[PDB]
Design a protein around this ligand. Structure first.
Ligand SMILES: [Mg+2]
Ligand SMILES: [Mg+2]
Ligand SMILES: [Mg+2]
Ligand SMILES: [Mg+2]
Ligand SMILES: [Mg+2]
Ligand SMILES: [Mg+2]
Ligand SMILES: [Mg+2]
Ligand SMILES: [Mg+2]
Ligand SMILES: [Mg+2]
Ligand SMILES: [Mg+2]
Ligand SMILES: [Mg+2]
Ligand SMILES: [Mg+2]
Ligand SMILES: [Mg+2]
Ligand SMILES: [Mg+2]
Ligand SMILES: [Mg+2]
Ligand SMILES: [Mg+2]
Ligand SMILES: [Mg+2]
Ligand SMILES: [Mg+2]
Ligand SMILES: [Mg+2]
Ligand SMILES: [Mg+2]
Ligand SMILES: [Mg+2]
Ligand SMILES: [Mg+2]
Ligand SMILES: [Mg+2]
Ligand SMILES: [Mg+2]
Ligand SMILES: [Mg+2]
Ligand SMILES: [Mg+2]
Ligand SMILES: [Mg+2]
Ligand SMILES: [Mg+2]
Ligand SMILES: [Mg+2]
Ligand SMILES: [Mg+2]
Ligand SMILES: [Zn+2]
Lengths: 146, 108, 115, 152, 306
RNA sequence: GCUACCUAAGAACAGCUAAAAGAGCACACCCGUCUAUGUAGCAAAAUAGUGGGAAGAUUUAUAGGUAGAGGCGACAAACCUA
RNA sequence: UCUCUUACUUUUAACCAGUGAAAUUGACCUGCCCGUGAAGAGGCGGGCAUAACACAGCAAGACGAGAAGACCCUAUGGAGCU
RNA sequence: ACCUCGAUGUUGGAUCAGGACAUCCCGAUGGUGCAGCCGCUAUUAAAGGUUCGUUUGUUCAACGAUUAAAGUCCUACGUGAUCUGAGUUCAGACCGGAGUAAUCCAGGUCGGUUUCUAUCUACUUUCAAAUUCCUCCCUGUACGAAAGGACAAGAGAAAUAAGGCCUACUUCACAAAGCGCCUUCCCCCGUAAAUGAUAUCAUCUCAACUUAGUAUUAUACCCACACCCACCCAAGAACAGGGUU
């Protein structure tokens, strides 16, 4: 299991690919636990540098583990149209880009042609994980107890 | 492409009379316990299939004659009857569709 | 991967890469058996219509796992023999170049930040 | 190469295939009996299983309501599916939609099959009944079972 | 004439589960009866010799899991589970080819209803349930093992290079560019039906083509032998082998793992059981997992450099 | 009656910028610079856009005339029923 | 476009049901090497090769299919221009 | 001008390679106007590579950057029933010239339709035993007045080709590929030297023999004659292959 961390260091974007299960990892510390409107922040490479820029010596904020994990509903702008990928396509499903101050109405109208309304109701392609989740939860509980 | 000569009748016989192109003899044909009109394994009998198809068609005709116009679909179950046969007590909320013939021996 | 005819940006503090020019510096040859250049390889860079060597200190494709992924192609200039051209390196240099210690001793000494 | 991949193509693409499957599902909900090629009836049964599951999960749910409104182009079949086929299988899980194979069609000679839900007010199809428990082999098996039971 | 028949044809609705349970109990009892082969009538064990070989095993490729070492590097190991592994028969030297003896080893267990008559008769005379595949290992004379003994995955120890061979994933009738790796013509450069064509095959003076010409066809449906596979972890409870590298084949398939014949690893099995690891005569219980002196164990307290 | 020219009576050209215009983009329309498909094809000359024009040296429905030692020709030895 | 190609859909591709061609055919029981011949041999000499019969793809050869060659030459056979 | 004008498609490039040495190299020798790394001569060995680019129409030809090389010839000056004509084999035109005109240019340029459903032979993994660059103690030692640098051995990192994988990176997902990962194990005949007579010395032998001096009569996939309706499949065009406890 791996994860990529995005951060700008002296006007330069650095992306490290750590591993959740690696013998070289010392300790994993969470600075600010929060959610967003998207489960994949791969569109931060084409955004403004001030959004992906965070202080390296910031103090981690501590809170209770019962706030239902507050979600940060903050929109991020984008650089003109020299982007990396076509984020305007409906297959990515992104609700954190301001298309009003970056793209026009004709561009959205011509990009909505690749929309697949039948994919949302495919039914068979849905991965119903419930029994497997209960089984692995029982397993981890039995492993943690004794 | 164009042939330089002509194939013979021997080559034609060797090509068309080979056991690979000949129809294989299947050994899945048996008899049916009911009626008996030459059926096959893993395949339903055509006689009983035609009978149940005609019965379903008649039931659908009666339903359409009872419903009338399209776009209906009742929110209750249905039950078919025949000559006589008073409705039971557990079939009150179900739609009654009676026919005009005797009850067959293969429908219970 | 830095191959050939690639518009790379000089991140040094010399009078060649920092000077404006109507044509961006592009690579023309990679000192390797194949035409694939990774971090820590010598390449030829044409700056202001000249022929000078260069050193790859960070491309853009993700290599292994424990490695940084820069958004821009960072390249530090170098001469023939081991003497760097620039004196101040503001962009961060990855720690994967410290395994050499023999041919890039001064380049790692003139650097500042490390990731 | 199509290893571990199903989704048998029928129409001119995924959209046409989904539309044909939706039409077949609507016809199966309405008439409760449809003869069609084996792949079509197989996909229809595979989708009808999940349709029955979602209809049994609940009625006031907006997700199941939207799915029933999308997969049914006749509207009137939604209340029927929610108030007849859902309370019927309250004791069953995923055991329904029995598939039976028919010979061929009198037009292009294609492999077809007929499926239907359980119960069914229509007369049942001639099911391939197994042999009775009175034949020689069955009687010998029963005798061997009784012998091993009395010897244990 | 005689028609096709199977095992569950002339059975009632109350006999098929009974027969299934009966045959399941029968095969379970037959597998449990061959659990202690040393207490029966074992063959005399000969000491290890530098000019001799041993018999391999038959495993099942589960999946591929990452693995790390102590120096910081990351390797890849493949899971090879050994379900049921036994010896079928024994052929002498003067009956096969007059060179080296052989041993018949079978794969995992299957059913007795989908096998040939001779196969069922042989497995009834031997006393074991039928297997899926049968492999043959070329051994010497002093390594003679009595047929009918269980073979566990603990026969190998961490620190030995083995060779695993199996049937690779077939691609069917494919093109030549994906098969042999030939380059292709350009795309939209005015090309007229030639993006994936091989072109020439021979010359005009010979008047024919050579049989050793790479042409499209079937590829991948063959057995490939892999060399240089070092084991890093040996499991005892689940009997899982951790061989380094990749195994030629798909998942959930029977493989054939044996000792290596490379000249760099000639006589390196002196510290290994030459006959077969018997869990009865060892008078000791091996741990659940056998780790190597270079692989980072999961219970390591975060290794740090100095 | 297809095509070159002429004669008499008619029809066609959204919208925006309209600098006054044998102005521009651009529907329908006139012709076809290129890619890909076929050469016993849909077709004895086709399929989409990238194309030029589209208020005039433009196109078109009807009727008549100029035919081989010739007709016509904003001259291609181009056309005169594949 | 390439290094270095790849993930999907349609036409199409393989089998089932029928109408069903065109070019082309001296007959074929039709393998390879060396050498010879009207000078580039599956049918000639010496060797090597050999149970028989279909399906699914590529072009190396049978100087393969379409036009009595439009390029060179002959014709007391023609025509155009000056 | 010897079959070939009742038709032999013509220069390259993409793909595919086969054979030959008059050999660039890694394999092995002798000499040197060989002081050591740079060179030359003569022999055996073909298991491989023979780059990245520009412009001129090129098989020719010109210039920038590497290692051992950007080697040669034949295969219809290899390959258009696979691909493109940039010119070369037409109908139009322009510049210059010969010519009264017409007309023409081994003087130059702009564009100039590329058609075939495989009949026959033959093919469709031949299962495999690779090659090489750099660095580290030796090495700054033999060598000169100085540059500089090895012969050989040990170890570690790397390039091309082949055999596999999805679990970690990408194409983006009940799958398949590379941009990611593992392995690739044996040689090949030319000299340096004892004894010996013919030729009583000496003599390595197209004499009888002794050392490098022949790897190998190598090792792993895969070798059960018949239960087969139907379903599934990492197996697959049909067929065929595996499971159904
Ligand atoms: Mg990109
Ligand atoms: Mg279809
Ligand atoms: Mg290509
Ligand atoms: Mg094309
Ligand atoms: Mg064409
Ligand atoms: Mg005109
Ligand atoms: Mg105008
Ligand atoms: Mg205009
Ligand atoms: Mg003229
Ligand atoms: Mg047919
Ligand atoms: Mg003669
Ligand atoms: Mg010949
Ligand atoms: Mg002939
Ligand atoms: Mg002629
Ligand atoms: Mg004459
Ligand atoms: Mg005359
Ligand atoms: Mg005359
Ligand atoms: Mg005349
Ligand atoms: Mg002649
Ligand atoms: Mg000729
Ligand atoms: Mg001819
Ligand atoms: Mg010809
Ligand atoms: Mg030689
Ligand atoms: Mg080029
Ligand atoms: Mg040629
Ligand atoms: Mg040819
Ligand atoms: Mg062609
Ligand atoms: Mg043009
Ligand atoms: Mg054939
Ligand atoms: Mg022939
Ligand atoms: Zn019947």
């Amino acid at each position: 299991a791996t994860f990529i961390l995005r951060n700008v260091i002296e006007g330069q974007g650095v992306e490290i690919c750590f591993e959740l299960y690696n013998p070289r990892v010392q300790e994993i510390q969470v600075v600010k636990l929060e959610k967003r409107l998207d489960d994949s922040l791969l569109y931060l490479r084409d955004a403004l540098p001030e959004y992906s820029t965070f202080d390296v010596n910031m103090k981690p904020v501590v809170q209770e583990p019962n706030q239902k994990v507050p979600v940060n509903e903050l929109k991020v702008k984008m650089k003109p149209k020299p982007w990396s990928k076509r984020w305007e396509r409906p297959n990515f499903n992104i609700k954190g880009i301001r298309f009003d101050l970056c793209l026009t109405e004709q561009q959205m109208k011509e990009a909505q042609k690749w929309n697949q309304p039948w994919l949302e109701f495919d039914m068979m392609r849905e991965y119903d994980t419930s029994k497997i989740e209960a089984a692995i939860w029982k397993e981890i509980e039995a492993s943690k107890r004794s | 492409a164009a042939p330089k000569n002509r194939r013979t009748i021997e080559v034609n016989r060797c090509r068309r009379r080979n056991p690979q192109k000949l129809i294989k003899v299947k050994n899945n044909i048996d008899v049916c316990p009911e009626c008996g009109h030459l059926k096959q394994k893993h395949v339903l009998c055509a006689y009983c299939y035609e009978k149940v198809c005609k019965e379903t068609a008649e039931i659908r005709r009666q339903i359409g004659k009872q419903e009338g116009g399209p776009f209906k679909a009742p929110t209750i179950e249905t039950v078919v009857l025949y000559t006589g046969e008073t409705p039971s007590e557990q079939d009150q909320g179900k739609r009654i569709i009676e026919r005009d013939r005797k009850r067959p021996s293969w429908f219970t | 991967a830095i191959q050939k005819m690639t518009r790379v940006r000089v991140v040094d503090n010399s009078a060649l890469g920092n000077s404006p020019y109507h044509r961006a510096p592009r690579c023309i040859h990679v000192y390797k058996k194949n035409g694939v250049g990774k971090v820590g390889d010598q390449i030829l860079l044409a700056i202001k219509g000249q022929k000078k060597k260069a050193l790859i200190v960070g491309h853009c494709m993700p290599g292994p796992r424990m490695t940084p992924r820069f958004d821009s192609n960072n390249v530090v200039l170098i001469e023939d023999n081991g003497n760097p051209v620039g004196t101040r390196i503001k962009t961060p240099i990855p720690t994967s170049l410290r395994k050499r210690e023999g041919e890039y001793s001064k380049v790692l000494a003139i650097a500042q930040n490390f990731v | 190469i199509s290893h571990g991949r199903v989704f048998r193509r029928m129409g001119l693409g995924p959209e046409s295939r989904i539309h044909l499957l939706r039409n077949l599902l609507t016809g199966l909900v309405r008439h409760e009996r449809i003869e069609a090629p084996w792949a079509r009836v197989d996909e229809m049964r595979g989708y009808a299983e999940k349709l029955i599951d979602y209809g049994k999960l609940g009625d006031t749910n907006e997700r199941a309501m939207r799915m029933a409104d999308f997969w049914l182009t006749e509207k009137d079949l939604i209340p029927k599916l929610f108030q007849v086929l859902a309370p019927r299988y309250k004791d069953q899980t995923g055991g329904y939609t029995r598939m039976l194979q028919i010979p061929n069609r009198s037009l292009d000679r294609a492999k077809m099959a007929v499926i239907e839900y359980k119960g069914n007010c229509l007369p049942p199809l001639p099911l391939p009944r197994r042999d009775s428990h009175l034949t020689l082999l069955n009687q010998l098996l029963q005798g061997l079972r009784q012998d091993l039971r009395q010897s244990q | 004439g005689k028609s096709g028949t199977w095992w569950d044809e002339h059975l009632s609705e109350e006999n098929v589960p009974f027969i299934k349970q009966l045959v399941s109990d029968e095969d379970k009892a037959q597998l449990a009866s061959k659990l202690c082969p040393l207490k029966d009538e074992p063959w005399p064990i000969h000491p290890w010799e530098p000019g001799s070989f041993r018999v391999g095993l038959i495993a099942l490729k589960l999946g591929m899991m990452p693995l790390w070492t102590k120096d910081g590097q990351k390797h890849v190991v493949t899971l090879l589970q050994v379900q049921d592994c036994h010896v079928l028969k024994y052929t002498s030297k003067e009956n096969c080819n007059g060179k080296m003896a052989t041993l018949s080893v079978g794969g995992k267990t299957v059913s007795r209803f989908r096998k040939a008559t001779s196969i069922l008769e042989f497995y009834r005379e031997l006393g074991l349930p039928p297997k899926q595949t049968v492999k043959i290992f070329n051994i010497t004379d002093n390594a003679a093992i009595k047929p009918g003994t269980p073979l566990y995955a603990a026969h190998f120890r961490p620190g030995q290079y083995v060779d695993v061979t199996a049937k690779t994933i077939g691609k069917g009738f494919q093109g030549v560019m994906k098969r042999w790796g030939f380059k292709g013509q350009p795309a939209t450069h005015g090309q007229t039906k030639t993006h994936r064509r091989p072109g020439a095959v021979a010359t005009g003076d010979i008047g024919r083509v050579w049989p050793g010409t790479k042409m499209p066809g079937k590829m991948g449906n063959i057995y490939r032998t892999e060399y240089g596979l070092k084991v890093w972890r040996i499991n005892t409870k689940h009997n899982i082998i951790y061989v380094n590298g990749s195994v030629p084949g798909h998942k959930n398939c029977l493989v054939k793992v044996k000792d290596s014949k490379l000249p760099a690893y000639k006589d390196l099995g002196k510290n290994l059981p030459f006959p077969t690891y018997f869990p009865d005569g060892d008078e000791e219980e091996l741990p659940e997992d056998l780790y190597d002196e270079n692989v980072c164990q999961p219970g390591a307290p975060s290794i740090t450099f100095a």
